[PDB]
C-alpha cells in the first residue's frame, strides 16, 4: 500500500477532546478561565484549548464522494517538499501541523518537511524543538539569521528543498485525508499549474474544523485591488468535465499552494524587490497567469487553517504597476491613496516580464477573469459631481457597510478624495457608484429620492429606472420618472438632493464632473 504515511495516527477516540474536528468547550473554574484568556490575548488563538487537544487528532472527511474513490498511481506522482515558516508559534499548534503532515501524506510522496524558524524568540522554539524533531523522519529545521517575513522565510526553505514540488503550508494547519495526492496529480499532468487546497476554517476559540462540503469559492479582487471571493462562474463550470476537477482561480485565495520547484524558479519565485510585507500574492497571481501559468483550487484537497482572532498598499501598487498596463488607472481612480505609495524600483520586474514573454493585462481580463466588470472611466465622465446651486457641495452616497444599498443619495462638502464622492457615467447611461462594488443610481418606482442597486451584469438588460441623461447644461435627466436631479435644503438647512419637475433654470439642477 503505497498510500501509507510515514507515521500512522493512533485509533480515533470519540471521547477525546476535539476528536474528528468537532468543536471543543471546556468546563473551567475562574482561575482556568483567566489562563485561557491570557493565552488568547498573547496568541490570538485559544492555546489553552489547543494544549488539551491531541497533536494527532482525526478530522472527519466530508469531501464530495468522487474525491474518496479516486485512485492514484503512486509510482509516477511527483514528490514534494512541504515548507512551513513560523514566527513565535505556540508549541501545540506548530506540532499538530507537523504531525498532521506526517500522518496524512503518503511516505513515497513526502520527500521532506522543512521548517523555517524566522528568528523566533520563544525559548521552547530553540534547542528543544530540534530535539523533538530529531525523532521525526524527514523533518528538517532551518533558522533565519534575521527577521525575514513569511515570503523570504519561505524562499529560504525553498532554496533548501529538493522535492519535485514545493508545497507551502503554514504553521497552524491540519490536513484532511487525501489532501496531497490531488495537488501532485494535477502538477504531474501540467507542471505550470499552481494548485491550492481548499482552505477550510479551524475556529481559533473552539478548534472546530469547518469543512467546505461542495463547490469552493475562488479568488478575485475588486477595483480597489482588495482580495474578494467570488463564486465559480458559469464559463468555468462548463469548461470542466467533473465537479471535482481543479477550478481556475483568477487570484490566489490564501497562502497554501503547491508548485513545481523548477517552474517556481523559472517564474522568479516571489517578487523579492517588495521590501514591505503582505499582499505579495496578487503580484504572484498576475505573473503566473500572464506568463502562462494556471492558478487552480482543487476541491479534493482540503487543509484547515487556524485563522486567528482579528495594510500593504505599496505591494498592491507594485502589482498594478508591473502587470496591469493601462488598467491600473481604474485602480488609482478608486483608491487614490495608492497614488502616493512608494512601490519601488520595478526595472528588473519589467525585464522579467519581457524575458518570460508574458501576455497583457487585457488578455488576462478577457481570458482569466471575464466575469469582472471593467469600468470605462471615460475622460470627463468620472470623479466627483459638483452642484452649481450649492457650489461647495458634491454628490455623496454614504451607506452603513452592513448593506451597501441602505442609504439615499445626498450632498456633502467636496473633498477631492474619491470614496463616497466617486461616480462614473457610463456609455449605457448609468450613474455608477463603483469605488467598492458595481452599484447603479436608481429612482425607485413612483418615489422621488435616489437609491442604489446592483448594476446589471455585463450584457444583461439595463433597467429603465437606472438610465440617466447627462445633458450639456448640467441637467441630470431621468426618463423613467421624467423628473430631474435637483439640489435643495431640508427643514434644518442641510444640503441634499431630490427628483423635482425639470427646470433648466433652477441652478440646483445643473451639475459638473471633476478630476
Q: Which keywords apply here?
A:
515 residues, alpha+beta, 2 domains, six-stranded antiparallel sheet, 24% helix
Structure report:
The chain is α+β, with helices and mostly antiparallel strands and 515 residues long. It folds into two domains: 1-374, no CATH class; 375-515, no CATH class. Helices cover 24% and strands 23% of the residues. The chain has helices spanning 30-43, 47-50, 65-69, 91-104, 127-134, 150-160, 180-189, 234-239, 261-267, 280-290, 313-323, 328-334, 347-355, 361-367; strands at residues 80-86, 110-117, 139-143, 165-170, 173-175, 193-202, 209-210, 218-221, 227-230, 247-248, 257-260, 294-306, 382-387, 393-396, 410-413, 423-425, 431-433, 439-442, 451-454, 469-470, 476-477, 484-489, 495-500, 511-514. Strand 2, helix 5 (127-134) and strand 3 (139-143) form a beta-alpha-beta unit. The longest helix has 14 residues, at 30-43. The radius of gyration is 27 Å and the shape is elongated. 42% of the residues are buried. It is classed as transferase. Keywords: GalNAc-Ts, GalNAc-T4, short-range glycosylation preference, long-range glycosylation preference, (glyco)peptides, STD-NMR, Molecular dynamics, enzyme kinetics, transferase. It forms a monomeric assembly. The entry is titled "Crystal structure of the human GalNAc-T4 in complex with UDP, manganese and the diglycopeptide 6". The protein is Polypeptide N-acetylgalactosaminyltransferase 4.
Amino acid at each position: 500500500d503505497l498510500s501509507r504515511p510515514l507515521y500512522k495516527k493512533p485509533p480515533a477516540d470519540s471521547r477525546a477532546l476535539g476528536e474528528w474536528g468537532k468543536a471543543s468547550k471546556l468546563q473551567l473554574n475562574e482561575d482556568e478561565l483567566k489562563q485561557q484568556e491570557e493565552l488568547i490575548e498573547r496568541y490570538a488563538i485559544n492555546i489553552y484549548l489547543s494544549d488539551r487537544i491531541s497533536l494527532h487528532r482525526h478530522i472527519e472527511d466530508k469531501r464530495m464522494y468522487e474525491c474518496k474513490s479516486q485512485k492514484f498511481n503512486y509510482r509516477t506522482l511527483p514528490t514534494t517538499s512541504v515548507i512551513i515558516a513560523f514566527y513565535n508559534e505556540a508549541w501545540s499548534t506548530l506540532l499538530r501541523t507537523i504531525h498532521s503532515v506526517l500522518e496524512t501524506s503518503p511516505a513515497v510522496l513526502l520527500k521532506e518537511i522543512i521548517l523555517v524558524d524566522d528568528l523566533s524568540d520563544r525559548v521552547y522554539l530553540k534547542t528543544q524543538l530540534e530535539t523533538y524533531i530529531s525523532n521525526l523522519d524527514r523533518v528538517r529545521l532551518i533558522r533565519t539569521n534575521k527577521r525575514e517575513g513569511l515570503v523570504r522565510a519561505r524562499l529560504i526553505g525553498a532554496t533548501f528543498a529538493t522535492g519535485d514540488v514545493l508545497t507551502f503550508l503554514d504553521c497552524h494547519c491540519e490536513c484532511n485525508s487525501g489532501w496531497l495526492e490531488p495537488l501532485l496529480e494535477r502538477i504531474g499532468r501540467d507542471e505550470t499549474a499552481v494548485v491550492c487546497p481548499v482552505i477550510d476554517t479551524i475556529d481559533w476559540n473552539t478548534f472546530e474544523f469547518y469543512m467546505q462540503i461542495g463547490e469552493p469559492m475562488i479568488g478575485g479582487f475588486d477595483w480597489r485591488l482588495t482580495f474578494q471571493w467570488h463564486s465559480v462562474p458559469k464559463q468555468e463550470r462548463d469548461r470542466r468535465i467533473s465537479r471535482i476537477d481543479p477550478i481556475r482561480s483568477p487570484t490566489m485565495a490564501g497562502g497554501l499552494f503547491a508548485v513545481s520547484k523548477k517552474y517556481f524558479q523559472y517564474l522568479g519565485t516571489y517578487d523579492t524587490g517588495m521590501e514591505v510585507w503582505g499582499g505579495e500574492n496578487l503580484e504572484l497571481s498576475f505573473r503566473v497567469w500572464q506568463c502562462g501559468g494556471k492558478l487552480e483550487i482543487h476541491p479534493c484537497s482540503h487543509v484547515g487553517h487556524v485563522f486567528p482572532k482579528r495594510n500593504f498598499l505599496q505591494n498592491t501598487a507594485r502589482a498594478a504597476e508591473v502587470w496591469m498596463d493601462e488598467y491600473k488607472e481604474h485602480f488609482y481612480n478608486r483608491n487614490p491613496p495608492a497614488r502616493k505609495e512608494a512601490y519601488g524600483d520595478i526595472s528588473e520586474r519589467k525585464l522579467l516580464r519581457e524575458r518570460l514573454r508574458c501576455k497583457s493585462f487585457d488578455w488576462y481580463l478577457k481570458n482569466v477573469f471575464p466575469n469582472l466588470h471593467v469600468p470605462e472611466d471615460r475622460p470627463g465622465w468620472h470623479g466627483a459631481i459638483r452642484s452649481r446651486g450649492i457650489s461647495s457641495e458634491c454628490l455623496d452616497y454614504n451607506s452603513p457597510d452592513n448593506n451597501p444599498t441602505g442609504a439615499n443619495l445626498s450632498l456633502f462638502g467636496c473633498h477631492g478624495q474619491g470614496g463616497n464622492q466617486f461616480f462614473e457615467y457610463t456609455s449605457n447611461k448609468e450613474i455608477r457608484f463603483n469605488s467598492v462594488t458595481e452599484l447603479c443610481a436608481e429612482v425607485p418606482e413612483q418615489k422621488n429620492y435616489v437609491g442604489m442597486q446592483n448594476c446589471p451584469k455585463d450584457g444583461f438588460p439595463v433597467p429603465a429606472n437606472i438610465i440617466w441623461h447627462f445633458k450639456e447644461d448640467g441637467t441630470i435627466f431621468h426618463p423613467h420618472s421624467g423628473l430631474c436631479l435637483s439640489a435643495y435644503r431640508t427643514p434644518e438647512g442641510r444640503p441634499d438632493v431630490q427628483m423635482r419637475t425639470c427646470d433648466a433654470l433652477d441652478k440646483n439642477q445643473i451639475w459638473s464632473f471633476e478630476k
